[PDB]
Amino acid sequence: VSQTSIANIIYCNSVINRLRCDQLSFDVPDGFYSTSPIQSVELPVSIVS
Amino acid sequence: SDFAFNNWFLLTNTSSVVDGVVRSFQPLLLNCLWSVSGLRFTTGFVYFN
Amino acid sequence: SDFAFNNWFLLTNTSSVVDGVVRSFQPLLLNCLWSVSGLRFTTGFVYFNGTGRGDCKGFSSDVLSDVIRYNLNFEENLRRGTILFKTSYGVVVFYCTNNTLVSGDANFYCFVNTTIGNETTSAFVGALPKTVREFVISRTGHFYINGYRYFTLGNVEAVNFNVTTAETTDFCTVALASYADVLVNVSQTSIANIIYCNSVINRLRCDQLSFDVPDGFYSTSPIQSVELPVSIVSLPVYHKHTFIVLYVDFKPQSGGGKCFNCYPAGVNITLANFNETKGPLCVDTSHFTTKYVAVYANVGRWSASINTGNCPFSFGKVNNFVKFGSVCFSLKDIPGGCAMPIVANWAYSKYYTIGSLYVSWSDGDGITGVPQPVEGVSSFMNVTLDKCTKYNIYDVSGVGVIRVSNDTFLNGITYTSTSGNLLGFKDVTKGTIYSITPCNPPDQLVVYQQAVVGAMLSENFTSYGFSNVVELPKFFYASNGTYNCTDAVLTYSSFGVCADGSIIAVQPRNVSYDSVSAIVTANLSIPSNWTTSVQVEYLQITSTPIVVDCSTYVCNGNVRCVELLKQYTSACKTIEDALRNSAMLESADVSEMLTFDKKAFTLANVSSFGDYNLSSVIPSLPRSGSRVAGRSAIEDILFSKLADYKKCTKGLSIADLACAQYYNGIMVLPGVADAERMAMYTGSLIGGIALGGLTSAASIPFSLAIQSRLNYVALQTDVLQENQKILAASFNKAMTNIVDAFTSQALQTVATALNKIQDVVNQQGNSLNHLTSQLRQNFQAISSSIQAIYDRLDIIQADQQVDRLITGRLAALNVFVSHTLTKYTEVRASRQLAQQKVNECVKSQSKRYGFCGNGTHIFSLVNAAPEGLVFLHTVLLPTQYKDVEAWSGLCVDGRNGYVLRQPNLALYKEGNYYRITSRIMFEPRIPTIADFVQIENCNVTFVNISRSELQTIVPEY
Amino acid sequence: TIEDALRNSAMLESADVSEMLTFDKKAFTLANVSSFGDYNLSSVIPSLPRSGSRVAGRSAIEDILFSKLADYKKCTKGLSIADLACAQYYNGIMVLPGVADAERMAMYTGSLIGGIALGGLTSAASIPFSLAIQSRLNYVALQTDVLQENQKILAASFNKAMTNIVDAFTSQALQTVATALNKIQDVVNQQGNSLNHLTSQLRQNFQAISSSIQAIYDRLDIIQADQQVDRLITGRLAALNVFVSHTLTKYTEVRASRQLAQQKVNECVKSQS
Amino acid sequence: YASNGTYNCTDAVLTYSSFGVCADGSIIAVQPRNVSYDSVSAIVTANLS
Ligand SMILES: *[C@@H]1O[C@H](CO)[C@@H](O[C@@H]2O[C@H](CO)[C@@H](O[C@@H]3O[C@H](CO[C@H]4O[C@H](CO)[C@@H](O)[C@H](O)[C@@H]4O[C@H]4O[C@H](CO)[C@@H](O)[C@H](O)[C@@H]4O)[C@@H](O)[C@H](O[C@H]4O[C@H](CO)[C@@H](O)[C@H](O)[C@@H]4O[C@H]4O[C@H](CO)[C@@H](O)[C@H](O)[C@@H]4O)[C@@H]3O)[C@H](O)[C@H]2NC(C)=O)[C@H](O)[C@H]1NC(C)=O
Ligand SMILES: *[C@@H]1O[C@H](CO)[C@@H](O[C@@H]2O[C@H](CO)[C@@H](O[C@@H]3O[C@H](CO[C@H]4O[C@H](CO)[C@@H](O)[C@H](O)[C@@H]4O[C@H]4O[C@H](CO)[C@@H](O)[C@H](O)[C@@H]4O)[C@@H](O)[C@H](O[C@H]4O[C@H](CO)[C@@H](O)[C@H](O)[C@@H]4O[C@H]4O[C@H](CO)[C@@H](O)[C@H](O)[C@@H]4O)[C@@H]3O)[C@H](O)[C@H]2NC(C)=O)[C@H](O)[C@H]1NC(C)=O
Ligand SMILES: *[C@@H]1O[C@H](CO)[C@@H](O[C@@H]2O[C@H](CO)[C@@H](O[C@@H]3O[C@H](CO)[C@@H](O)[C@H](O)[C@@H]3O)[C@H](O)[C@H]2NC(C)=O)[C@H](O)[C@H]1NC(C)=O
Ligand SMILES: *[C@@H]1O[C@H](CO)[C@@H](O[C@@H]2O[C@H](CO)[C@@H](O[C@@H]3O[C@H](CO)[C@@H](O)[C@H](O)[C@@H]3O)[C@H](O)[C@H]2NC(C)=O)[C@H](O)[C@H]1NC(C)=O
Ligand SMILES: *[C@@H]1O[C@H](CO)[C@@H](O[C@@H]2O[C@H](CO)[C@@H](O[C@@H]3O[C@H](CO)[C@@H](O)[C@H](O)[C@@H]3O)[C@H](O)[C@H]2NC(C)=O)[C@H](O)[C@H]1NC(C)=O
Ligand SMILES: *[C@@H]1O[C@H](CO)[C@@H](O[C@@H]2O[C@H](CO)[C@@H](O[C@@H]3O[C@H](CO)[C@@H](O)[C@H](O)[C@@H]3O)[C@H](O)[C@H]2NC(C)=O)[C@H](O)[C@H]1NC(C)=O
Ligand SMILES: *[C@@H]1O[C@H](CO)[C@@H](O[C@@H]2O[C@H](CO)[C@@H](O)[C@H](O)[C@H]2NC(C)=O)[C@H](O)[C@H]1NC(C)=O
Ligand SMILES: *[C@@H]1O[C@H](CO)[C@@H](O)[C@H](O)[C@H]1NC(C)=O
Ligand SMILES: *[C@@H]1O[C@H](CO)[C@@H](O)[C@H](O)[C@H]1NC(C)=O
Ligand SMILES: *[C@@H]1O[C@H](CO)[C@@H](O)[C@H](O)[C@H]1NC(C)=O
Ligand SMILES: *[C@@H]1O[C@H](CO)[C@@H](O)[C@H](O)[C@H]1NC(C)=O
Ligand SMILES: *[C@@H]1O[C@H](CO)[C@@H](O)[C@H](O)[C@H]1NC(C)=O
Ligand SMILES: *[C@@H]1O[C@H](CO)[C@@H](O)[C@H](O)[C@H]1NC(C)=O
Ligand SMILES: *[C@@H]1O[C@H](CO)[C@@H](O)[C@H](O)[C@H]1NC(C)=O
Ligand SMILES: *[C@@H]1O[C@H](CO)[C@@H](O)[C@H](O)[C@H]1NC(C)=O
Ligand SMILES: *[C@@H]1O[C@H](CO)[C@@H](O)[C@H](O)[C@H]1NC(C)=O
Ligand SMILES: *[C@@H]1O[C@H](CO)[C@@H](O)[C@H](O)[C@H]1NC(C)=O
Ligand SMILES: *[C@@H]1O[C@H](CO)[C@@H](O)[C@H](O)[C@H]1NC(C)=O
Ligand SMILES: *[C@@H]1O[C@H](CO)[C@@H](O)[C@H](O)[C@H]1NC(C)=O
Ligand SMILES: *[C@@H]1O[C@H](CO)[C@@H](O)[C@H](O)[C@H]1NC(C)=O
Ligand SMILES: *[C@@H]1O[C@H](CO)[C@@H](O)[C@H](O)[C@H]1NC(C)=O
Ligand SMILES: *[C@@H]1O[C@H](CO)[C@@H](O)[C@H](O)[C@H]1NC(C)=O
Ligand SMILES: *[C@@H]1O[C@H](CO)[C@@H](O)[C@H](O)[C@H]1NC(C)=O
Ligand SMILES: *[C@@H]1O[C@H](CO)[C@@H](O)[C@H](O)[C@H]1NC(C)=O
Ligand SMILES: *[C@@H]1O[C@H](CO)[C@@H](O)[C@H](O)[C@H]1NC(C)=O
Ligand SMILES: *[C@@H]1O[C@H](CO)[C@@H](O)[C@H](O)[C@H]1NC(C)=O
Ligand SMILES: *[C@@H]1O[C@H](CO)[C@@H](O)[C@H](O)[C@H]1NC(C)=O
């Protein structure tokens, strides 16, 4: 955003784009980063008492 | 990419930021490309369809 | 001691620890030794009494036993048994039938049926253990099987054990016991041994959460634990009383036949103060004594009483010196006010409350509850003087001892310290003032060889069994031994302690040094042949980097938590960005510092050296593997004296401690100083000593090399080199001595290095040992578990109590990062110094005093060590000095006087002829004319020689 | 962990500072001012015992500096009201006696000062101070004059400069002295206000009804008293951990200054650089 | 370690103390800095440079 007006956007779909958006920047310098890919669906429920 | 979107605006309940980089939730699905070409007074009723 | 107690177990309500050291409260009183020998089915009823048919052994007091423990020593077979519990309210029995039928035999079904009075009830066992090795019971009624507690019965008057065993060797024990405070060592969740916390030394040891605390200094506070006289003081004002009394008269028709909690004849409970208008009754006279009042006629086993509510002040304690601005106690409800409930118990089995005592209050200094019922025109100010006491002085409470003082101080009435604790007060009556010393100031004690010896105190008294209390400046000191001042086995800057505890004043290190040798044309002494020595130093070089995943650490896998965090990515990005950039920076530096020479690495073969036999330093050959190098002897000795995640998502083992940390999100990177290139670097440096500039690449004998290095200090001028052959015998002996010291000041130096290494390792570990503990505590939330928080609440009020967790966690994380940066920025200095001296001492002899050793420096070895290096500075120390008679200059028969071209030389008259020697070694050199220089003005103070005898000294003509 | 860290660090640093302080009885006796000469460095030399069995006494520049800048034995007994320091003991802080005691400190300083007039001689006797300066000069270059005007001229400027600077205590050199004095008062303030900040925090109660634990017990029954108690200690432990983590950061940094000091005292003090 | 490229060990475009990575993602063990230095030249009455 420049002068409160939009300039461009980046969809957070791909893994690389995900990391880039997480970086709050563009063009992260070549290096090492950490990530956690997580399942987002219902899972079987188990109980023991 | 490269869309000017000069008219296009952000949405904020609170005070707007200026000239910053921000990730957020926006209603940006392309959906129907135009859906209003040649708009006239009898625009009809569209109900999230 | 030495009891196996394999069957014996711990007791824990919560999850059991495994393989740890823990001090806790356990029921471990020996009481009756056995009390169950030859146990048969008719075991009888024992009720927390000495009435146990067994050999108590006479160490048993037989007063009372808090708990009953059953230890079973039978083969792993099922034998019919029943358990009977007798309580005044009811008799409960436990039965199990092997057969499928509910009656079964007198698929396994167990039924425990409890009958109260004439009513019989049936209960469900549910889960049945495959095998039970131990049984625990208590008077409170807690029931423990194999440590965990399944359920707790209300009360047990007596216990009867219906166990029948055909086997003559039926079982090992069924005993009684009582609580105590002990420490335990647990391996694989199973006990190994314990330590009773009775003696003072044992008390300190248990406090140390360890055994065998190292000899040193510790602090202790011995405290009286009995009732003390109570003293009160208030401003004298003629007491005008107010009595608030309440008449609860529960009086039901027994309640055991139908219901006790049904509030029968429960009705009127009231206090005379109610008004027909019923305006809230707030007292006006400041002095009032609240009392519970009389109670209704009480029948067996049941009662009613008041309970603490939600107000700040508990009713009944209000009279104990409290303040209030407006009581306004009311029987009905009061808007915006606290309320308390009275409940009734039928043998502690039915709880039924009653709306009671609406109270609201303003804060103030006028109204004050007084315990003493009598209030009137009287004189009282009880004040015990010189004993430990409680006290209330002008609405301030505490404990201590009162001392009379002499200080006018008529300005006011109370004096308080900066901390907020009052120091002294003045009587209203006369003007005297009294101080308030605390009862038990901390005392400093000393321990050595796992026993206490000596003690620093404050009072001129022998508190312990010590036979002497030597008064000393700034403190007193007790000891149990005579003063013989033989030596010190411990030391502090001011003083050291003797073996028996005698105190001694330290005499600093007797040493001696040298200085410039001013030419004075008189007698002087030069050092003769030296002896070798070795000094050891240690330098921190690197820090094990750590990395953290923000979102794992705080979110812990909850998607909703992740989404609430999503708006804070502006914040926590800085943390991991800083840690990562700092790690890669320092690793780049340490990788830039490590050079290598293949030409010289091969030279590290011990055959190249000679008599020195520095076997330990040289790197080991590969152990039939394709590895460039192996750690040296001093290396694995040091490591000895001091995991893969690949196995932490797979495998069949339970996760390890390190493995757990990964789950939480901390992640320790592999260390920068890996052994391969570390050993190559060290070996190359070591091989750079025997390599000198040659047209060929071959080596030369090590002996010649030392001579060359010596030449640097001065021109060694001897043809038959005794030093080369003598110093090695001292050198290799010193080395064997010091490696033995690993496995004479040099010894204390080695002790200092070792202490420093264990220091840095502890300093590194307890950082994250402190970090990972803080998430176990919830700052303000109902519970730590985010998942549980979501379970306990709907969408509107769950996130609201969630976010205050992360608001604290982020702060703790920012603290951690801000302290890690402060570790790196400081270790960088030590890195600078290390690189600055390794390339100086290791490569080229220094001419700087005190940088490479106590005296003149010859060469230095280097090896690796945890996150650091270690040096071996070989030096030279003068064995003896040779005296000699000199001349500060020369005068020819002509006016011209001659002097020397550089100062470091000095003439002397060895015999008839004159010899000029070095100032730093006794090596002598021939005189010649080229070594002199001319100055016109003759000083008479020099040698006086003409041109004739000049030809006798130097062949001029 | 708190007290274990503080104790181990204290004994470590005290062992180091005790390892650094050497002594020479041969040279300590040489500190007699009669040995020097026109220089009259009266201020530096250590004072003789004041009719007491004390090895040494502080020098003039020493007590001037201290001037410009208790026993617990009397804190459980006596008739006086407790002093501020005394109060701290009651609370539980405890300042250990300083490592640099005056006796061995003065012996060390005096021995170093006496190492200047001592040169290698067959006998143990001294030589005139004048000859010594000439030898040190030779190091820079072969002083070649027979009638040594420097020895006699520079002393008149030297003793005058010294009187000027001791007056400055009681020209860039002046600003240098001002800087040192400012640095000393800086470190002393920096040391005091640490525990002056510590001991104040227990006067405030983080969330409890009142600070006084005894009062808290008076105002409540067993079930709801410990519950409002523990949140006191939950804060107090945090404050304590902050204090220890900042003390370790003071030690680990002062160690560098110690290194530099030992590195230059043995260089400049002993042999011209 | 996963990678999408073959191992040819040409060079390293990124590095960490234990190891470095190739341009295509192939992993490589670092060889420390080949250097050489000198030392005292003991008089030995023989060939030297
Ligand atoms: C100004 O302030 C206003 C204040 O009102 C803001 O308006 C609110 O904005 C929030 C955030 O966008 C919005 O919450 C979202 O609502 C939409 C619509 O909800 C309905 O759609 C879901 C399917 O997505 C259906 O299940 C159902 O019809 C939803 O309605 C229900 O909401 C909850 C949660 O689903 C239900 O339990 C209730 O029963 C109720 O019927 C959602 O699209 C969005 O859902 C996302 O989060 C939920 C909860 O975690 C999750 O279950 C959804 O799957 C989804 O999460 C992700 O899934 C999609 C799948 O396509 C994936 O692509 C993304 O990763 C998704 O994030 C969420 O519930 C809220 O309703 C608004 N307020 C109201 C009252 O309308 C406004 O935005 C502010 N403007 C700014 C920014 O200034
Ligand atoms: C699993 O979770 C359960 C939860 O219930 C745990 O069970 C509780 O364990 C605690 C701690 O052991 C236990 O508290 C202790 O109770 C026993 C028995 O109390 C009765 O004995 C005392 C004499 O000691 C009598 O005065 C009176 O009969 C006691 O009963 C009364 O309790 C309070 C306090 O005394 C009274 O005010 C009430 O009126 C009530 O009638 C006690 O032995 C123990 O007492 C110790 O502390 C108190 C309070 O400070 C002190 O006054 C005692 O003198 C004693 O302190 C020290 O004195 C002895 C002297 O020999 C000295 O040797 C030690 O230094 C002592 O520490 C305390 O009251 C609690 O009752 C249990 N719960 C119930 C409901 O029974 C179980 O432990 C958990 N298991 C684990 C570890 O996983
Ligand atoms: C974020 O948004 C800002 C706003 O558009 C971007 O900055 C703008 O970037 C353009 C180029 O992308 C700049 O234009 C260049 O400016 C120079 C100097 O005037 C001109 O000579 C060039 O020909 C070109 O026009 C422009 O100055 C700059 N303006 C501002 C206000 O920043 C920025 O690049 C965007 N960043 C990302 C990552 O999207
Ligand atoms: C705390 O409890 C553990 C568990 O018993 C103690 O460790 C065990 O200590 C024994 C000796 O006391 C070790 O036995 C020795 O092991 C070696 C190597 O196997 C063997 O050669 C010896 O002959 C002897 O058996 C045993 O290995 C060790 N086991 C474990 C799991 O630690 C520990 O000493 C106890 N500490 C205290 C202070 O009580
Ligand atoms: C470097 O440090 C070492 C250790 O501090 C010094 O070693 C020691 O040198 C002193 C002389 O200052 C020796 O003292 C004397 O020993 C004789 C014979 O026992 C005794 O009769 C004298 O009265 C005096 O005590 C001491 O023996 C010696 N110790 C060792 C273990 O070597 C060394 O002198 C220091 N070098 C310099 C230049 O300061
Ligand atoms: C100071 O550091 C620089 C850079 O680390 C060193 O420069 C390099 O010196 C090495 C010798 O140790 C040279 O190595 C050789 O080069 C020849 C010709 O390419 C090759 O045939 C050999 O097998 C070997 O690789 C290297 O070329 C040279 N590099 C540069 C950029 O100058 C310098 O030697 C270091 N000085 C000292 C005293 O360590
Ligand atoms: C300290 O000194 C006391 C006496 O000076 C020693 O006491 C004896 O200790 C045994 C063992 O408890 C008792 O049976 C004697 O009655 C004690 N004698 C007296 C006179 O009290 C004690 O053992 C000494 N302890 C140490 C560690 O030195
Ligand atoms: C829109 O409003 C105008 C009047 O403002 C009206 O004439 C017209 O009919 C309206 N459109 C529709 C589709 O009803
Ligand atoms: C939109 O389509 C859905 C699905 O056919 C239908 O239920 C709905 O009625 C449509 N919209 C309107 C306004 O009818
Ligand atoms: C245990 O002994 C006490 C004291 O004599 C006694 O009151 C009690 O009745 C005895 N136990 C039983 C079950 O009677
Ligand atoms: C269970 O209770 C019933 C009814 O009181 C009784 O008949 C039966 O014997 C009990 N079971 C036992 C004691 O195992
Ligand atoms: C355990 O039981 C066996 C069974 O024969 C017995 O011989 C032995 O004495 C018992 N050991 C004990 C009670 O410690
Ligand atoms: C309260 O109730 C009891 C029994 O119901 C009765 O004896 C008494 O008179 C009542 N009133 C007062 C003031 O106690
Ligand atoms: C206060 O002093 C009087 C006079 O000795 C005494 O009777 C009374 O019991 C004392 N009170 C207490 C609580 O000791
Ligand atoms: C200390 O105790 C000793 C023991 O005899 C006694 O002689 C001395 O007077 C006491 N001193 C003080 C100040 O109490
Ligand atoms: C120890 O004391 C005895 C008797 O007082 C004395 O003869 C001996 O010299 C002393 N020895 C030491 C090493 O203090
Ligand atoms: C060490 O120093 C003291 C100081 O006076 C002296 O008495 C003694 O001779 C010395 N002892 C040794 C063993 O050097
Ligand atoms: C010291 O010098 C004198 C000259 O005055 C000489 O007589 C004496 O022999 C010398 N001492 C020694 C030990 O040579
Ligand atoms: C020094 O040299 C003399 C004579 O060669 C010899 O007797 C003495 O043992 C030597 N001392 C040492 C420490 O080598
Ligand atoms: C000398 O070298 C041999 C070779 O292994 C070794 O066993 C021996 O311990 C060495 N001796 C010394 C004094 O280093
Ligand atoms: C020169 O000789 C004189 C003779 O009195 C002597 O005092 C002085 O120290 C000498 N100066 C030197 C040797 O530099
Ligand atoms: C040597 O010194 C003596 C003593 O002053 C003097 O008389 C003599 O002339 C000198 N001889 C020389 C300078 O050749
Ligand atoms: C200084 O030395 C002189 C004689 O050389 C002596 O009279 C005096 O007592 C010494 N000063 C001290 C403090 O010992
Ligand atoms: C010289 O020494 C005397 C001896 O006390 C002293 O009073 C005087 O101030 C000194 N003068 C200077 C300039 O130091
Ligand atoms: C009075 O107080 C002062 C100081 O508080 C103290 O020095 C003195 O000993 C006390 N007693 C008398 C009788 O002065
Ligand atoms: C790359 O791989 C090819 C085929 O394996 C091989 O011929 C070539 O030498 C390799 N080059 C480098 C630089 O690794
Ligand atoms: C660098 O070192 C390795 C180590 O064996 C060696 O094989 C190679 O010849 C060297 N390469 C260069 C380019 O110096």
PDB file of C-alpha atoms and ligand atoms in Angstrom, chain C residues 11-13 25 139-140 142 144 179, chain D residues 222, ligand 2:
ATOM      1  CA  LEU C  11       2.286 -42.691  45.733  1.00  0.00           C
ATOM      2  CA  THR C  12       1.169 -40.022  43.275  1.00  0.00           C
ATOM      3  CA  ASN C  13      -2.201 -38.517  42.430  1.00  0.00           C
ATOM      4  CA  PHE C  25       6.109 -36.665  51.798  1.00  0.00           C
ATOM      5  CA  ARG C 139      -7.541 -43.282  57.622  1.00  0.00           C
ATOM      6  CA  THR C 140      -8.741 -40.460  55.390  1.00  0.00           C
ATOM      7  CA  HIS C 142      -7.737 -42.676  50.078  1.00  0.00           C
ATOM      8  CA  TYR C 144      -4.104 -46.616  46.264  1.00  0.00           C
ATOM      9  CA  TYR C 179       3.881 -39.678  57.108  1.00  0.00           C
TER      10      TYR C 179
ATOM     11  CA  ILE D 222      -7.173 -22.383  54.697  1.00  0.00           C
TER      12      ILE D 222
HETATM   13  C1  LIG F   2      -2.984 -37.103  46.842  1.00  0.00           C
HETATM   14  O1  LIG F   2      -3.899 -36.055  47.133  1.00  0.00           O
HETATM   15  C2  LIG F   2      -4.455 -36.113  48.439  1.00  0.00           C
HETATM   16  C3  LIG F   2      -5.502 -35.013  48.513  1.00  0.00           C
HETATM   17  O2  LIG F   2      -6.310 -35.177  49.680  1.00  0.00           O
HETATM   18  C4  LIG F   2      -3.345 -35.940  49.468  1.00  0.00           C
HETATM   19  O3  LIG F   2      -3.860 -36.135  50.791  1.00  0.00           O
HETATM   20  C5  LIG F   2      -3.568 -35.005  51.638  1.00  0.00           C
HETATM   21  O4  LIG F   2      -2.194 -34.930  52.006  1.00  0.00           O
HETATM   22  C6  LIG F   2      -1.915 -33.794  52.821  1.00  0.00           C
HETATM   23  C7  LIG F   2      -0.408 -33.656  52.983  1.00  0.00           C
HETATM   24  O5  LIG F   2       0.107 -34.853  53.575  1.00  0.00           O
HETATM   25  C8  LIG F   2      -2.635 -33.976  54.150  1.00  0.00           C
HETATM   26  O6  LIG F   2      -2.340 -32.911  55.060  1.00  0.00           O
HETATM   27  C9  LIG F   2      -1.796 -33.470  56.268  1.00  0.00           C
HETATM   28  O7  LIG F   2      -2.731 -34.227  57.021  1.00  0.00           O
HETATM   29  C10 LIG F   2      -2.114 -34.993  58.050  1.00  0.00           C
HETATM   30  C11 LIG F   2      -3.242 -35.466  58.951  1.00  0.00           C
HETATM   31  O8  LIG F   2      -3.887 -34.297  59.475  1.00  0.00           O
HETATM   32  C12 LIG F   2      -4.206 -34.496  60.864  1.00  0.00           C
HETATM   33  O9  LIG F   2      -3.045 -34.723  61.671  1.00  0.00           O
HETATM   34  C13 LIG F   2      -2.674 -33.573  62.435  1.00  0.00           C
HETATM   35  C14 LIG F   2      -1.305 -33.790  63.071  1.00  0.00           C
HETATM   36  O10 LIG F   2      -0.290 -33.827  62.063  1.00  0.00           O
HETATM   37  C15 LIG F   2      -3.720 -33.295  63.506  1.00  0.00           C
HETATM   38  O11 LIG F   2      -3.552 -31.960  63.989  1.00  0.00           O
HETATM   39  C16 LIG F   2      -5.095 -33.413  62.887  1.00  0.00           C
HETATM   40  O12 LIG F   2      -5.647 -34.700  63.166  1.00  0.00           O
HETATM   41  C17 LIG F   2      -4.899 -33.250  61.391  1.00  0.00           C
HETATM   42  O13 LIG F   2      -6.144 -33.033  60.720  1.00  0.00           O
HETATM   43  C18 LIG F   2      -6.340 -31.623  60.403  1.00  0.00           C
HETATM   44  O14 LIG F   2      -5.601 -31.023  59.339  1.00  0.00           O
HETATM   45  C19 LIG F   2      -5.398 -29.636  59.610  1.00  0.00           C
HETATM   46  C20 LIG F   2      -3.913 -29.371  59.833  1.00  0.00           C
HETATM   47  O15 LIG F   2      -3.412 -30.153  60.925  1.00  0.00           O
HETATM   48  C21 LIG F   2      -6.207 -29.219  60.835  1.00  0.00           C
HETATM   49  O16 LIG F   2      -6.103 -27.804  61.028  1.00  0.00           O
HETATM   50  C22 LIG F   2      -7.672 -29.602  60.673  1.00  0.00           C
HETATM   51  O17 LIG F   2      -8.393 -29.195  61.839  1.00  0.00           O
HETATM   52  C23 LIG F   2      -7.764 -31.108  60.509  1.00  0.00           C
HETATM   53  O18 LIG F   2      -8.377 -31.685  61.663  1.00  0.00           O
HETATM   54  C24 LIG F   2      -1.170 -34.167  58.918  1.00  0.00           C
HETATM   55  O19 LIG F   2      -0.210 -35.050  59.512  1.00  0.00           O
HETATM   56  C25 LIG F   2      -0.412 -33.046  58.231  1.00  0.00           C
HETATM   57  O20 LIG F   2      -0.129 -32.093  59.256  1.00  0.00           O
HETATM   58  C26 LIG F   2       1.077 -31.374  58.954  1.00  0.00           C
HETATM   59  O21 LIG F   2       0.802 -30.047  58.504  1.00  0.00           O
HETATM   60  C27 LIG F   2      -0.056 -29.336  59.397  1.00  0.00           C
HETATM   61  C28 LIG F   2      -0.403 -27.979  58.804  1.00  0.00           C
HETATM   62  O22 LIG F   2       0.797 -27.216  58.652  1.00  0.00           O
HETATM   63  C29 LIG F   2       0.639 -29.181  60.741  1.00  0.00           C
HETATM   64  O23 LIG F   2      -0.242 -28.535  61.665  1.00  0.00           O
HETATM   65  C30 LIG F   2       1.027 -30.553  61.271  1.00  0.00           C
HETATM   66  O24 LIG F   2       1.727 -30.423  62.513  1.00  0.00           O
HETATM   67  C31 LIG F   2       1.889 -31.259  60.233  1.00  0.00           C
HETATM   68  O25 LIG F   2       3.058 -30.477  59.960  1.00  0.00           O
HETATM   69  C32 LIG F   2       4.257 -31.128  60.422  1.00  0.00           C
HETATM   70  O26 LIG F   2       4.179 -31.663  61.744  1.00  0.00           O
HETATM   71  C33 LIG F   2       4.743 -32.970  61.855  1.00  0.00           C
HETATM   72  C34 LIG F   2       4.696 -33.407  63.314  1.00  0.00           C
HETATM   73  O27 LIG F   2       4.949 -34.812  63.413  1.00  0.00           O
HETATM   74  C35 LIG F   2       6.168 -32.931  61.322  1.00  0.00           C
HETATM   75  O28 LIG F   2       6.812 -34.193  61.514  1.00  0.00           O
HETATM   76  C36 LIG F   2       6.146 -32.595  59.839  1.00  0.00           C
HETATM   77  O29 LIG F   2       7.032 -31.500  59.595  1.00  0.00           O
HETATM   78  C37 LIG F   2       4.741 -32.184  59.443  1.00  0.00           C
HETATM   79  O30 LIG F   2       4.741 -31.662  58.111  1.00  0.00           O
HETATM   80  C38 LIG F   2      -1.267 -32.381  57.174  1.00  0.00           C
HETATM   81  O31 LIG F   2      -2.365 -31.710  57.801  1.00  0.00           O
HETATM   82  C39 LIG F   2      -4.126 -34.000  53.877  1.00  0.00           C
HETATM   83  O32 LIG F   2      -4.814 -34.223  55.110  1.00  0.00           O
HETATM   84  C40 LIG F   2      -4.434 -35.111  52.882  1.00  0.00           C
HETATM   85  N1  LIG F   2      -5.824 -35.068  52.480  1.00  0.00           N
HETATM   86  C41 LIG F   2      -6.806 -35.541  53.236  1.00  0.00           C
HETATM   87  C42 LIG F   2      -8.151 -34.928  53.005  1.00  0.00           C
HETATM   88  O33 LIG F   2      -6.619 -36.417  54.065  1.00  0.00           O
HETATM   89  C43 LIG F   2      -2.272 -36.984  49.202  1.00  0.00           C
HETATM   90  O34 LIG F   2      -1.159 -36.781  50.073  1.00  0.00           O
HETATM   91  C44 LIG F   2      -1.797 -36.893  47.762  1.00  0.00           C
HETATM   92  N2  LIG F   2      -0.779 -37.887  47.526  1.00  0.00           N
HETATM   93  C45 LIG F   2       0.257 -37.604  46.748  1.00  0.00           C
HETATM   94  C46 LIG F   2       1.439 -37.002  47.444  1.00  0.00           C
HETATM   95  O35 LIG F   2       0.239 -37.814  45.549  1.00  0.00           O
END
